[PDB]
Amino acid sequence: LVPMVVEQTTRGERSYDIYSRLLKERIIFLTGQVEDHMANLVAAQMLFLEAENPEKDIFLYINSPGGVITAGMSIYDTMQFIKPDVSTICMGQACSMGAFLLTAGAKGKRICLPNSRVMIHQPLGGFQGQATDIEIHAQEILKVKSRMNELMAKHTGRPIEEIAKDTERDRFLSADEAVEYGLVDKIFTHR
Amino acid sequence: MALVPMVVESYDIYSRLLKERIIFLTGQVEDHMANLVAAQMLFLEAENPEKDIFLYINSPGGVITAGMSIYDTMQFIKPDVSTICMGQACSMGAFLLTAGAKGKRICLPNSRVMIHQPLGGFQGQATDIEIHAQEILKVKSRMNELMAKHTGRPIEEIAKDTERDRFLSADEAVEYGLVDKIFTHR
Amino acid sequence: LVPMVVESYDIYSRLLKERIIFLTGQVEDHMANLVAAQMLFLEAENPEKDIFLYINSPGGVITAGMSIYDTMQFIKPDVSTICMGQACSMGAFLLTAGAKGKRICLPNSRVMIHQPLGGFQGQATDIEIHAQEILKVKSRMNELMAKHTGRPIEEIAKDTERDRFLSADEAVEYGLVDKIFTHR
Amino acid sequence: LVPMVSYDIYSRLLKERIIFLTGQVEDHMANLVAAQMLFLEAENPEKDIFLYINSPGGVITAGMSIYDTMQFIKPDVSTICMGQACSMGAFLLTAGAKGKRICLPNSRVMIHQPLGGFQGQATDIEIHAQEILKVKSRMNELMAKHTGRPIEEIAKDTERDRFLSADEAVEYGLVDKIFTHR
Amino acid sequence: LVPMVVYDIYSRLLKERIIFLTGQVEDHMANLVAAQMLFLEAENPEKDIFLYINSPGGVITAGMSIYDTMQFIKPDVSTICMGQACSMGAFLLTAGAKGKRICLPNSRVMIHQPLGGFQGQATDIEIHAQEILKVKSRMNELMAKHTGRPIEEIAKDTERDRFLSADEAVEYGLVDKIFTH
Amino acid sequence: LVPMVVSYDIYSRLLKERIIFLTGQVEDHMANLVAAQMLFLEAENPEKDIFLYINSPGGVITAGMSIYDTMQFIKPDVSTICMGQACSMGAFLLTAGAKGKRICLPNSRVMIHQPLGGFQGQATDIEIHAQEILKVKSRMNELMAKHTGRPIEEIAKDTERDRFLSADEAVEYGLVDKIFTHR
Amino acid sequence: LVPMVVEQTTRGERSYDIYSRLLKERIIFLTGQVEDHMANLVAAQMLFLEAENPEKDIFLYINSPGGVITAGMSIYDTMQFIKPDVSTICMGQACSMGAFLLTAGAKGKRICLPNSRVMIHQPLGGFQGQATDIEIHAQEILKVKSRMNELMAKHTGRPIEEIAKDTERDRFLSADEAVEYGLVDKIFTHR
Amino acid sequence: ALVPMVVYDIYSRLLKERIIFLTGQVEDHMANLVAAQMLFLEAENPEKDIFLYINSPGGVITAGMSIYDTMQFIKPDVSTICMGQACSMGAFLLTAGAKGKRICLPNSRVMIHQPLGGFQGQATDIEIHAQEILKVKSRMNELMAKHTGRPIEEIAKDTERDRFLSADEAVEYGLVDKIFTHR
Amino acid sequence: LVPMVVESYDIYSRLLKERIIFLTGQVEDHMANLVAAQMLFLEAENPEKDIFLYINSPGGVITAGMSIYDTMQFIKPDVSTICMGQACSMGAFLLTAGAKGKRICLPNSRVMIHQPLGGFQGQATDIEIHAQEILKVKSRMNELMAKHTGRPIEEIAKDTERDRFLSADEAVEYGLVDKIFTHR
């Protein structure tokens, strides 16, 4: 089910799906596993909303356990490139790449809901083939890990060495702990 | 696909009842169906932030974080979310039922309510097992605190009662403080 | 595909304007939710005109069916139940739950009643909790069957221990339905 | 991919009071037919309905939902056999309004006794066996009523698969006439 | 493959009056243990039998075939826990002759209530639920007898998984002593 | 679900801003869709630039060459912007963009390596397919050399195995021209 | 296949499989994944070789990536219990529980072949179910991890704290590194 | 069963003649059986030669090294004869034979290449496993250099990709000592 | 099962004492190794008595077949080859590899020759290496066929580009076998 809303016009009626209707309020949803196709859709929505009005805020609701890093960095670089401030709101959970995109929001507009969960940890990977090729892919994953820690350090305001220590294994944070760590700025309870 | 629809001049029975400020939470709670409920709520607030929203719940439960995305949306939006239990509200469904606005949490007479502690499952190195084991305790504690707050029963009693599956009738759900009243006839 | 009519409506939306709802196939949450939704819609449309629920169901999930039953009782409109093809298990329960004097079998429709089914796996403590719950549900279903049929709970219990098949005539004599429709 | 004309092809023919019963008979497709019949009755309860049947049969109760709908509604339901009408499809063909049951020249009709299948306790098997016999007796009675042949002859003939040509279906009394050209 | 001597290694150690209970307890492997116990009794009904247990548990009725065979035969059955004895394996460990129930130093013992599962008509579910409660009560009674702990305490402690070290198994009364060298 | 605007879907609405998306594995059908959009935008205005956002790990070479040959053929300059990553054929279509209009975003990844193949059958057929794979490998290395301005011998050495480049390394190598951070 | 050897007797001939023949030389093989059944067979061979002669050495050839811990601890407790010294020789590799049973040999008789590989790391596990049950199984894995570190410390002569640090992640050792770490005593190249 | 007498197959009969067969994929259980046969033949007679017939495409390195170390440890010289093919680990065990007693048959095929592997998990774990495969790769190149008498740099270069050798080429390279055509 | 005979031997072990070896079905490492093992055994038993290799094979793995071929050429005894049923691909190669004057077809036996099959997937550099190797093996196989048949390599190459089916008589005329055996 995708719920529709009917707007009456001079020439009868037209129809909007609920998500298209909330897109007019400049609200984008990032829901479930981060992969190329759904991530492109999020990026497209950001580019559209920029063209519509490049000075109004964009609200990105995140409920994700993470997924593909490159797919996520397509969203990240879009958020930084576009003029509008992208306010990030955590719903349910933002883990792995979802936490990274949550902390990547415009400073002062990164929000957790009270019972939302945040989790951070180092990249995952896996190659198979000749020893020479394993060394090349092993070198690449280390470069990506260094870069992801560098960006986390920038957005949190914590030193890179501390980000590295804390993401060696799964680190779960409550909403309060995400504010204290510097992943988000404030907690929204009631409007 | 979309059931009992008419073309606009597809508009279905759920789209029609959404105008009456009615949202349906049906079946297993997971990210996508939960995102749809939250979206409907955000929409109904923008339409009118002062009229009540009616959330019909028939769910055995599911993913806690997905359910919490609805719970936090219910508390955040200005409108009171009235919860009505149809058929059953169990696990996460029972949680969202009791999370309705005080005075407007309703069971139908032959609706079934069931509460129990969280489920989980990790595999890997003992160090990681300890981290996830700790995280599951944190979530279990939080869920008991919120269940205590909404029911008005002490956390020690919620914890005791939810160690194993606890089935309640509509009458028992009112007594326990999960719901406020029973609706039989209009 | 489902045919459309221009006046543009699918055939079910068009029959819904005549206050007709269809309960077809296995009773589960999603199809049962739809039935309940249609009942709420028709009440809001007109709370004093009868609703016609056509039933062709072998049964299914009890809680899903109790979502329909509780909706039927709650809404102001009388819900007339008509049995097409068959009403077995939960379908039979929803057929007999209709407004008194407006529960109808068609001549060659079949009705079947029997006790609930269930199944759990795990610790003996949990098995005992689930066994108790299934007994409470069985007692409650037998009580409501007794209420709607007018037969005593003891007889309903005896008759539903094993599968009991009724013709249209036998369903009238048992009190599951009131009358049989052949022609207008 | 169903073609358009404003209307889909089946919806356009539904304005001409034409319903199609195609493929295996089961609860959902059978309900759709019964719904189209109730709709056409509300539209005009005196004009004929045309039910084109191309079916190998299927679920009896699903078929009986159509049969009872056909008998209840005021309009005469003319049945036309396209390709084949076997088992339950043959039963619904013979259930049409007398004078208006039609086979096309190369259509195939076939009749045989019900199939079933239960497993479990001997007590439950006895209950389910008794139910299958009652259904078989009832199905034979209704076939006897619509064909005009006695129940004893319907019973003997449906013990095993009995195939009929269009000519043989008219002789047996399953249909009234054959349409070759308009 | 199982190596041989001039007899396979298991037949050769059966001369030393040693029986192995290894892996999941089911009808066929349990029948083999009970068969070996009847054989060793017929060979010499006075000399002790050594049962080496390395089992996570399994089918209760299959395990009760070994238990009843242990009690029935004239010879004392000395139980030695190697690797682990959990669930039904723990039950057979504690069912050994008093003073001859042994844990090796790094062997693990675990006890918990029975598992079950039926599906069908509510009447049948009630019959199978009652049966599972009767078995649970019986298993607790026999655990109480062999440990010396009261039935009420055994019931509480087996509501959920309870892991014991070799030392804890001695303190609980599941085994009598620990063999090291 | 792709949302609608007033009525267009979001991708049709961004196509009016002359923006095309190349997303996921390169195969015949998605590649055809890119080339169709390129022919459409040319007809609409054959002088205004086209913007191709690339986020691809690569895929089928022939499918990718359908996009490459469409890019060169149409009058409008095709500006290529690397989102997330551009590897294999994705990198090839990135470097194929109009010179001075090939862009990486800061944390976008670029990777290049030689073609993959595979035939089974008679030794005669294996020889024919092996030759064909060498000719394609040569042709791809020539086109990479032409677009980067690096000699073919260097492109061959550097693509014998997987070669991963950052945004900065992609500019130095000559795969892209510039990096875009903020508008 | 398994190759047979024929011994001639007064009454014609008898036949041994190669493994049964080498068992008369007091040689046991621990090969592949450690699980209850193959481990029970190793223990049975040890109890047999004790009964035959409780003063002569037993040679346990190890080529294993590891497996079930309780299965391996059934072999460990048998080794310590029986009178005979169990000399452990590493063939190909001894990882995980493989490395644990290699180091559990009689002191001075733990051997690596030159190109054999040794690897050590902390226990693996995995439960699913009620939070209460997860807690119990999580407490059990920790208790087992402590016990395994204690025994590794005792057999290697390194302190428990160093064993714990070094086994948090996979630690690979060459034959030389295994002697230096104290997992084995000596390296056999030629007889 | 096999091709036997009841008193015992053709392999058991040829084991009496001090002949062992290494056939098919190298893995723990078949490699354990080879090493066992080698220990048995030493105990029977530690001075007579052992003949190891090798027809293998290779397999698990650690399994193959259990044989290698057994070959070097036991007192008897192990003569290696290549039947059909010796590739990867099979070629390694062929070249590991006693100097002067490593034999190719005329139409036997030899192929050498670097190790294969694969891990998936946390970047930290990947770094550890990536290091281990480099150590193993070095060690295998060192042992090949020793047995062939070629420098490790040439072994490394040649095994970066698959290198196929004829019987003649295997003698020239030093993988084997001589070719046996007729007795 | 395989029948036994008492003197206790299986039927194949008994015929092995008559110096008969069977090559039956798809040629692969394990079954080819068994044939080679038998050839070494019979040489050790008596290096001056002929060995009789019965061939019924569609072919299979070339290297596995070359393990038999090199064993045949190496051992002192003449290896007589008799074709039962069929000798195709590698089986035809091993048939023609028998001692000159002792390569035999049975009257209704079928022979078939064709060029090698192969298959690699991976990087274009690896595909070039494997392609070159396939061509070297193809050249070597054609050379050895040319030697044993006494036909020039150009003709063997032409005739094996596609599947070439020969009767017993056609096999003798081509030089793949020397004579046909009908009766003893």
Ligand SMILES: *C(=O)[C@@H](C(C)C)[C@@H](O)C(=O)N[C@H](C(=O)N[C@H](C(=O)O)[C@@H](C)CC)C(C)C
């Ligand atoms: C959190 O989202 C992480 C996991 C999904 C839990 C995510 O950040 C992650 O590690 N993703 C991994 C990934 O994208 N890895 C790529 C790759 O191997 O190609 C590398 C660029 C990482 C160095 C997995 C593969 C999804």
Ligand SMILES: *C(=O)[C@@H](C(C)C)[C@@H](O)C(=O)N[C@H](C(=O)N[C@H](C(=O)O)[C@@H](C)CC)C(C)C
């Ligand atoms: C009721 O709905 C419970 C289950 C469906 C029976 C639900 O509350 C629940 O426990 N869900 C469980 C869950 O969400 N667990 C998560 C997780 O493991 O990620 C933790 C937050 C709880 C420790 C699973 C999804 C059923």
Ligand SMILES: *C(=O)[C@@H](C(C)C)[C@@H](O)C(=O)N[C@H](C(=O)N[C@H](C(=O)O)[C@@H](C)CC)C(C)C
């Ligand atoms: C008739 O509809 C019955 C079956 C379909 C034959 C139906 O009444 C029924 O018993 N359904 C069962 C069911 O809903 N059981 C629930 C349950 O276990 O959830 C028990 C609570 C009933 C006490 C089965 C599960 C379909």
Ligand SMILES: *C(=O)[C@@H](C(C)C)[C@@H](O)C(=O)N[C@H](C(=O)N[C@H](C(=O)O)[C@@H](C)CC)C(C)C
């Ligand atoms: C012709 O259509 C027959 C079969 C498709 C061949 C049909 O008449 C039939 O026998 N249907 C069967 C059926 O519906 N049986 C039900 C049942 O199993 O409950 C009994 C009521 C009739 C004996 C098959 C099983 C669909």
Ligand SMILES: *C(=O)[C@@H](C(C)C)[C@@H](O)C(=O)N[C@H](C(=O)N[C@H](C(=O)O)[C@@H](C)CC)C(C)C
């Ligand atoms: C320990 O070994 C227990 C499980 C393996 C964890 C074992 O004692 C157990 O509970 N076994 C169970 C069983 O045998 N149950 C039978 C049954 O349901 O048939 C009942 C007689 C006990 C209530 C499971 C089924 C193996």
Ligand SMILES: *C(=O)[C@@H](C(C)C)[C@@H](O)C(=O)N[C@H](C(=O)N[C@H](C(=O)O)[C@@H](C)CC)C(C)C
């Ligand atoms: C990058 O995109 C490469 C692969 C995804 C790794 C791509 O360049 C590539 O090699 N594609 C391959 C391909 O298209 N090969 C064709 C073919 O064999 O059909 C040949 C033309 C290459 C010589 C694979 C097969 C997709």
Ligand SMILES: *C(=O)[C@@H](C(C)C)[C@@H](O)C(=O)N[C@H](C(=O)N[C@H](C(=O)O)[C@@H](C)CC)C(C)C
């Ligand atoms: C090396 O052998 C380790 C793994 C096989 C890589 C081994 O020591 C190991 O961790 N085994 C795990 C194990 O035995 N776990 C049991 C269990 O949870 O059941 C615990 C007793 C260990 C804490 C197996 C692989 C699960």
Ligand SMILES: *C(=O)[C@@H](C(C)C)[C@@H](O)C(=O)N[C@H](C(=O)N[C@H](C(=O)O)[C@@H](C)CC)C(C)C
């Ligand atoms: C030749 O036999 C090679 C392959 C079979 C083609 C063989 O040498 C090889 O590389 N084997 C590989 C292997 O054993 N890898 C192990 C491993 O990943 O565990 C590493 C020690 C290699 C550095 C694979 C597993 C067959």
Ligand SMILES: *C(=O)[C@@H](C(C)C)[C@@H](O)C(=O)N[C@H](C(=O)N[C@H](C(=O)O)[C@@H](C)CC)C(C)C
């Ligand atoms: C006849 O027996 C041939 C095929 C079965 C038709 C046989 O001669 C053959 O070609 N076998 C092939 C083979 O051995 N190919 C290897 C290989 O690809 O590894 C190459 C050496 C071919 C040059 C196939 C694979 C069975």
